[PDB]
Symmetry: C4
C-alpha cells in the first residue's frame, strides 16, 4: 500500500564525487550500429524504486537524416522522453511520454507526474500526465512562450509544486507556481517580492515546510532569482541571491555588482539554468550549486557549497568545491535531483554537456552526474569523449 | 485479485489537445541504424495498468528489401503486433500476437483479448487469443472477406463486445456482434434496422447499458451507420447518423444529402474508418468525432463534438473543435479509445498518418494521439516530420 | 505459493488453424539494420505464465561474417537460446542458456528445466540446468553422439521425463528415459520392446498415467517408433506406429510396407523429427501428427489426426486435416507443445522452416505455429516470405 | 520479506563442465548490425533470483570509431556495466552503474552492492552504490592506484567483505578489507602476515566463519598470496600458497621455487587474476583453481583441484582437472563465483578470453563459464569463434 513521499534527512557525506556519465553519442558514428536520440535539456527525477533520466528529443537519431533543426528550441516534433537512469537513451530504449518543447516530472510516492509544454509561442499549453492518463492543462497567461522548469518538480504529501513562467526572454517574465495533486491543478500560487523575471527554476526541499528554487533571469541580472515557497501556507517570495559568487552565465567578475543585494548590475542579459540541490541535516541545511567555468561561454562546470544562512542576505562568496567539467569541455544546463536510499536521501547534481558544432550538423547532449558521497574533496572531472566528426 | 472493469464517468474537461506522436519512420532512413516495422491500421487499447499500441505489420522493416506488397491489404505474412504505448514499434520492441490482416483487442480487467482475422478472402477466419492462449474462432458467413473493427473492442463485466462483418466492399456487408468471455465466443448478436453495409466500427460505452459505434459504409453513403447496442438485453440497432456533418471520406458538401435521415445520397462509394469516443458525464453525454479535412482525399483530420441528442434523428451540424492534422498532411484511419485514470476515464482519439509514396516504395504509418484535456480550445496540429526519400 | 503442474483436459475445438509465424530473417537483409540469430531445431515450451521459443544457435547473426559452418550440426559454439514466444529472436532479444548442440526444456509449475548436450561426438554430455543453476549431468553410454529430443520435455507433479539416445545414426540407437526432479536425475528408465533405433522423440501426456512419444528411426524404417511411458510405474515400451500413413521422411507409398505391424519395409534410412501432440478429452484421446508433403524431401507439411485407438495396432490411415506448409515451401522439423489457458490446455504444432541455400551461404530457420482452435477445417498455409539472396 | 544470505553447503558433484560462452564480438563484424560493448575484466555475481554479468567498458562499441585507447587500463570514460547473465552486453542491453576502472559487486540477499574505483592514479576513489543510491566512498591510502577485486565481493548476514589495495604494481601493495553494510563501510580490516603485495583477490566462503582468497602478486612471486579472513572476529592473515602448482602467470616450472613455503622465487614480476572457488561439503572442503596453460603468456586455461589440507603449508601439487581453454586460445583473467540453487550453492569459474590485436585495433573480451556439474571428468574446451579482421 504505497504512501505519499516526503523529503527525508540527507545521507551522510561532505563532498560530491563523479558518479555516472551518460554519453549516448559515443555510439552514434557512421561506422557504428546504434541509434542514440538527439536531445537537449536533460534532467533526472527519482521515485521510491527507480531513477528516470528525462530529456526533450528532436525525434531524430544519430546517425540520421533529420539534423536540420536540431539546434532549434521549439517545433511540433519535440517530445518528453525517458529511460531508466543508467540506460543509453536510444530509439529503442526510450519511451515517449508526450509532445513537449519544455518539461518536468516528479514522483509523489504513488505515481509519476509528467509535465510538458507545447503549442504556438503566443499561446502555448502546459499539459499534465498522471501515469498513463492526461489529466489537466494550463494556458499561457502572457502569450509569450509559456514554459516550465526543465527539471524535477517536487512532491510532499501528494502535493506537487511546479514553477512555470510566461513572458519575453528579454523583458518581463513573472513566474507562477502550480500546486498539482494526482495530476490535477488545485491551486495557483503568485509569488511576491522580486518578480520581474524568473525562469527555469531548479527547486528542492530545504525542509518539510519550505521549497527553495534557484532560477534564471535571462534579462536583467547575472544574480539568480531565489524562490522561497512555504508549502504549509502555499505562499512564495522571490529575491535575488546575494552571494558575490554570481551563478548565471554570462556574469561580470564576482563581487563587482555594487549597491544593495537587489542591484541587478551588468552582463545580466542572457542566462543559463543552474544546478542547485539541498543537503538536509538535523540542524544544518547545505546548499550546493553549479556554474560554468567560463564567465561568458557555456564551457566548464564548477561545484559550490554553502551551509546555512539566508541566500537573500549573505554576500559571502560560495565555497568552491571542485571542477566537475573542465573549461575545455561543454558545460550547459545543470540541475539538482535526489536519489532515495533506504532511509535517507542522496543529493545530486546533473550536468548537460552539449555537443555543439553549429547549425550545419547535429546538435545534442550528454549528461554527467555528481552526487554527495563520503568525505574529503571532489576528485575527478568528466569528459564527454565524443568527436562530432564521426 | 483483479475485478472486471466497467465504463466510468469521464474525467473533467471540455477540449482535446495534442498529446503524443508515434512516428517510427523518423528513424527509418538509410543513413540510420534503426528498424521500425512497416505497419498500417494502428489502434490503441488500455487496461487498468498499461496502454498498448497495436498495428498490422507487413512483417517488414524500413530500411529493408520487402517494400513490394506493403501497399496491399491482405497476405499470409501480416500479423497483429503491439508495443507499450510510447515505445517505437521496431523489430526488437514489438511482440507478434498472431497472423492477421484485420484486428482488435481489449482488456477485460483481468486479461488481454486479442482478435485477428486471416485466411483466404472467400473463407477467412476470426481468431481469438486470451492472454497467450488461442481460445476460439469464428467463420466467414458470407465468404467475402470476413473482417473486424481495426480498433479496441469493449468489455463490461467480463463480457467483451466486438463488431465483425462480411460481404462485398461495394455491396451488402451485414455486420454482426460477438459477445466474448474469457476468450470464448458465447453469443452472436444480429443487429436490426439499417443493416445493408456496416464495417470498421469504432465503438465505446455511452453508459453501463449501451455501446455505441460510428461505422464505415464503403458502398452506399457518406453518412456513418450508427450502432446502438444494448448490453443488458444483448440486442442492437443500426441507423445512419443524421448529422449534416458527414463523417465519411469521400463525402459531398455538408447538409447536401437531401431528404429524411435515412437517405443515402451521393459520393457514397468508398470510405474510411473514423474516430469516435464518448465523454460520459452525470447528466449528459458528449460525442467526439473526427473526419478528414478534404472531402475526397485522405488528407487532414478535424475534430468535432456534440452533446446529447439522438444521433439517429438530429440533423444539427457537429461543432467544429479544431484541426488535429492540417490538410497538407496525411489523415487516414482514426479511432477512439479511453485511458484508465485512477477514478475516471480519459477519452482519446488516435489518427493514422500514412506515408504513401505509391506502390513503387514502402508504405507505412505514424500515429497521432489527441485527448480530452482541460478546457479552452484545441491548440496545435500534428506533422509526421518524415521525408520518404530518406 | 506455486504448485506442481499436471496435464489438464484439452480446451474445446476440433481443428487446427494458423496461429503465428516467427520469421527472423525477414529482417536480415544487408539493406536492413537487424540482427536475427542463425538457428536451427526450434521448439516451444510453455509454463503457467509464459511461452518460450527455444532454438540452437550457431552464435552468429544475419547479416554477418560467420556463415561458414552454419550448415553443420555440432561445434563448440552452439548454444541453447530462447525468447518469449512472439518476439523476434535477435542478438539483443535472445538469452543464452547453455552450450548445447542438442536440447530440450520444460516447466514443472515452479521452475524452468533446461537441457543441453555438448562435447565430442564419442563422449558427449547431457547437462541439466534448473533456473540459473547447473544441477546434473549424464554421460554418453554408447559413445556415438549422445543426444536428446529437440523438443519440450514433460513434467507431472514435479517429475520431468526426457528421452535421450546414443548410438550410430545408421545403426543401433537404444534410447533411454531420464526422470528429472528439481534439476536432478533421480531415475533411468530402460524401455522394452522395439528398441533398435529411437531418437528425437516428440512427447506429450495422453493422461496423468501415460506419456506418449512419436519418434524417429533414422536407420531401419519410415514408420515412427512410438513410445508409451507409464508415469506411475516408471516403465516404458516401444513399438512402431502401425498406421498406413507413414510419418517419416523419406517414406515409401502409404500402406506399401507389407507384413505385420513390426515390419520395417523400404526407404527406412534417413528421417526427420515429427510433430505429435495430444488432445485430451473426457473420454477420447485425440492424436495430431505432422509429416512433410514430399515423400523424400523436406518440403511441405501436412496435418493429420486420429481419435482413440492403439497406435501400435491400428493400420488405418490417419485423417488428413490440412496443408500447413505448401509443397513449394520448406518443411523440416516439427514438434508438439501445449499452451496453458486458464482452466485447460491448448495443443499446438510448431514447424521448422529452414532457409537452405547450400554450404556456400547462411543456413537458418523460421518457425510456424498451428494450434487447436474452434471447429471446421484448417484454412491457411504458411509461407516464410524470405528471399535468401538479400 | 527478504532475509540475509549465508554460504550454504555446495551441491553434489565431483567435476566441472563447460556451461556457457558469452562471446559478444561474434556479432561485432562490419557486415553486421549489432553493437557489443568493448569491455575487459568481466566477472559474475549472483543473488537469490538472478545472476549478473559485469564488466568494465571503454564506453565504446564494435564496430565503432573509438578503438584507440581501449588497450589502456584507466581513463575518465570507463564504467562498470552489467547485463543479466546470458544476455549479450550491447549498447542497448547493458546498464551503466557508475564511472569505474576497477570494480566489484555482490548481493546481500536484499539488495545489490556495486563497487567502482576511479579518479587520478595518485588519488583514486572507491565508490559504493547500494541499489540505485551512491552511499559511501573510501580514499587512496598510498596514492598509487587504489583498486579492488575485479570479481564478486562476499556477503554474510548483511555484512559484505571486499578486498582493496594500493601501491606500486612493481613494489609494495598492502591490501585492506572493507566490511560493508547496506552500502556503508563500517570497518577496515588490516591483514597480518605476508603482507607486502596483494591485489585482485578472488574470494569465497570456506565456511560460515572463514573467507578465503587467492590473490595476485604482480611484483615478487608467482605463488599466490592466500588470505584467510575470519568473519567472526573480523581479522585476517595472508601467507603465500605453498603448492608446487604455481597459479600465477608468469611463473617458473612447477616445484622449482626451492626453500620453505614463504620463498618468493623467480619469474615473480608480472601476474594475472586467477580463478578460485570453494566446494563446501559437510566434512571436507574442496578448493578449485585455474591457471593459464602457458607459463609466460596469457594463453589457455586449465582447472585444478585439491581437497582439504592447509594451502599455507601443503606443497602437494594440485590435481589437474582438465583443459577449459586450449593453449591456442587466449586465457586472461579468471574468477570464481557461486550460483544459488534452491537448497545449495553451485561453484563456478569464469574465464576472460581477451581478443588482443595489439594497440592498432579494438581490444575486448569474451567470457567462458565452467561449473561444478555431475561426476566424471571435464569434457570440452572453449573457443571464442571470433576473427578480429571482421
Ligand atoms: C457502471 O457500473 C459500475 C459497477 O456498478 C460502476 O462502478 C461502481 O461505482 C461506484 C461509485 O461510482 C463504486 O462505489 C464506491 O466505492 C468507493 C470505494 O471504492 C472501492 O471500495 C472498496 C474498497 O473499500 C472496493 O471493494 C470496491 O471494489 C471499490 O474499488 C466508495 O468510496 C464510494 O462511497 C462508493 O461506495 C463501486 O465500487 C464501483 N464498482 C465497480 C465494480 O467498479 C460505475 O460507476 C458505472 N458506470 C457509470 C455509472 O457510468
Ligand atoms: C551458515 O549459517 C546459516 C544460518 O545459520 C545456515 O543456514 C541455515 O541452515 C539450516 C539447515 O541447513 C536451516 O534450518 C532448516 O530449515 C528448514 C526449513 O527452511 C526454512 O524454514 C522456515 C520455513 O518453514 C523459514 O523460516 C527458514 O528461514 C527456512 O527458509 C528445515 O526443514 C530444517 O529441518 C532446518 O530446520 C536454516 O533455516 C538456515 N538459516 C538461514 C538463515 O538460511 C547455513 O547452513 C550455514 N552454512 C554452512 C553450515 O555451511
Ligand atoms: C518530514 O515529514 C515526514 C512525515 O512526518 C517525516 O517522516 C517521518 O519520519 C519519522 C521519523 O523519521 C518516522 O517515524 C518513525 O519512528 C520510529 C522510531 O521510533 C521508526 O521505527 C519508524 O519506522 C519511523 O521511523 C515516520 O514514519 C515518517 N513518516 C513518513 C510518512 O515518512 C520526515 O522525517 C520529515 N522530514 C524531515 C523532518 O526532515
Ligand atoms: C491430473 O491430475 C491432476 C491432479 O489430481 C488433476 O487436477 C485436479 O483437477 C481437479 C478437477 O479438475 C481439481 O479439483 C477441484 O474441483 C473443484 C470443483 O468441485 C474446483 O472448485 C477446484 O478449483 C478444482 O477444480 C484439482 O484442483 C486439480 N488439482 C491440481 C493439482 O491441478 C487433473 O485434472 C488431472 N488431469 C486429467 C484427469 O486429465
Ligand atoms: C512486386 O511483386 C509482384 C508480385 O508479387 C511482381 O509482379 C510480377 O512481375 C513479373 C515481371 O517482373 C510478372 O511476370 C509476374 O506475372 C508478376 N506477378 C504478379 C502476381 O503480378 C512485381 O514485379 C514486383 N515488383 C518489383 C518492383 O519487384
Ligand atoms: C591515439 O590517441 C593518442 C593519444 O590519445 C594519439 O597520440 C597522439 O599522436 C599525435 C600525433 O598523431 C601526437 O602529436 C600526440 O602527442 C599524441 N598524444 C599522446 C597523448 O600520445 C594517437 O595518435 C592516436 N592514434 C591514432 C591511430 O589515432
Ligand atoms: C480487411 C481489409 O482488407 N480492410 C482494408 C480496407 C477494406 O478493403 C475496406 O474497408 C472495404 O471493405 O479498408 C482500408 C482502407 O485503407 O480503405 C484498408 C483495410 N486494410 C486491412 N485492414 N488490412
Ligand atoms: C587498476 C588497474 O588498472 N588494473 C589493471 C592491471 C594492473 O595494473 C595490475 O594488477 C598491477 O597492479 O592488471 C590487468 C592486467 O591485465 O594485468 C588490467 C587491469 N585493468 C583494470 N582493472 N582497469
Ligand atoms: C525555448 C524554451 O522554452 N526554453 C529555452 C531557453 C529560453 O530561450 C530562455 O530560457 C529564455 O526564456 O533557453 C535554453 C538555452 O539553451 O538557452 C534553451 C531552452 N529550450 C527549450 N527548453 N526547448
Ligand atoms: C547432430 C544431432 O545431434 N542431431 C541432428 C540430427 C541427426 O544427425 C539424426 O537425428 C541422426 O541421429 O539430424 C537433424 C537433421 O536435420 O536431420 C539435425 C540434427 N542436428 C542437431 N540437433 N544439432
Ligand atoms: C532545413 O534547411 C533548409 C535550408 O535552406 C531550410 O530551408 C529549412 O527551413 C530547414 N528546415 C528546418 C526544419 O529547419
Ligand atoms: C570455412 O571454409 C574454409 C574453406 O576452405 C574451410 O577451410 C574451413 O574449415 C571452414 N570453417 C568452418 C568452421 O567450417
Ligand atoms: Ca542573466
Ligand atoms: Ca462511404
Ligand atoms: Ca527413417
Ligand atoms: Ca607474479
Amino acid at each position: 500500500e504505497p504512501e505519499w513521499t516526503y523529503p527525508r534527512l540527507s545521507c551522510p557525506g561532505s563532498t560530491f564525487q563523479k558518479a555516472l556519465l551518460i554519453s549516448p553519442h559515443r555510439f552514434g558514428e557512421t561506422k557504428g550500429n546504434s541509434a542514440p536520440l538527439i536531445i537537449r535539456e536533460p534532467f533526472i527525477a527519482c521515485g521510491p524504486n527507480e531513477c528516470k533520466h528525462f530529456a526533450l528529443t528532436h525525434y531524430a537519431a544519430q546517425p540520421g537524416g533529420y539534423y536540420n533543426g536540431t539546434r532549434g528550441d521549439r517545433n511540433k516534433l519535440r517530445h518528453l522522453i525517458s529511460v531508466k537512469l543508467g540506460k543509453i537513451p536510444t530509439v529503442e530504449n526510450s519511451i515517449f511520454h508526450m509532445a513537449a518543447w519544455s518539461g518536468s516530472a516528479c514522483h509523489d510516492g504513488k505515481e509519476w507526474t509528467y509535465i510538458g509544454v507545447d503549442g504556438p509561442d503566443n499561446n502555448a499549453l502546459l499539459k499534465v500526465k498522471y501515469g498513463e492518463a492526461y489529466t489537466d492543462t494550463y494556458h499561457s497567461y502572457a502569450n509569450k512562450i509559456l514554459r516550465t522548469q526543465e527539471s524535477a518538480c517536487n512532491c510532499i504529501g501528494g502535493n506537487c509544486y511546479l514553477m512555470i513562467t510566461d513572458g519575453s526572454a528579454s523583458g518581463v517574465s513573472e513566474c507562477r507556481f502550480l500546486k498539482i495533486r494526482e495530476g490535477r491543478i488545485i491551486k495557483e500560487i503568485f509569488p511576491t517580492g522580486r518578480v520581474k523575471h524568473t525562469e527555469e527554476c531548479t527547486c528542492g526541499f530545504a525542509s518539510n515546510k519550505t521549497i527553495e528554487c534557484a532560477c534564471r533571469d535571462n534579462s536583467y541580472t547575472a544574480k539568480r532569482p531565489f524562490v522561497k515557497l512555504n508549502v504549509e501556507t502555499d505562499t512564495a517570495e522571490i529575491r535575488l541571491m546575494c552571494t558575490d559568487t554570481y551563478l548565471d552565465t554570462p556574469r561580470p567578475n564576482d563581487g563587482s555588482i555594487t549597491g544593495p543585494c537587489e542591484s541587478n548590475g551588468d552582463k545580466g542579459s542572457g542566462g543559463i539554468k543552474g544546478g542547485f540541490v539541498h543537503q538536509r541535516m538535523e540542524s544544518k541545511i547545505g546548499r550546493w550549486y553549479s556554474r560554468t567555468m567560463s564567465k561568458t561561454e557555456r564551457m566548464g562546470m564548477g561545484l559550490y557549497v554553502k551551509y546555512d544562512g539566508d541566500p537573500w542576505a549573505d554576500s559571502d562568496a560560495l565555497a568552491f568545491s571542485g571542477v566537475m567539467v573542465s573549461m575545455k569541455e561543454p558545460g550547459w544546463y545543470s540541475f539538482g535531483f535526489e536519489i532515495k536510499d533506504k532511509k535517507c536521501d542522496v543529493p545530486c547534481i546533473g550536468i548537460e554537456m552539449v555537443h555543439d558544432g553549429g547549425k550545419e550538423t547535429w546538435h545534442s547532449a550528454a549528461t554527467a552526474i555528481y552526487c554527495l558521497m563520503g568525505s574529503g574533496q571532489l576528485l575527478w572531472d568528466t569528459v564527454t569523449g565524443v568527436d562530432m566528426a564521426l
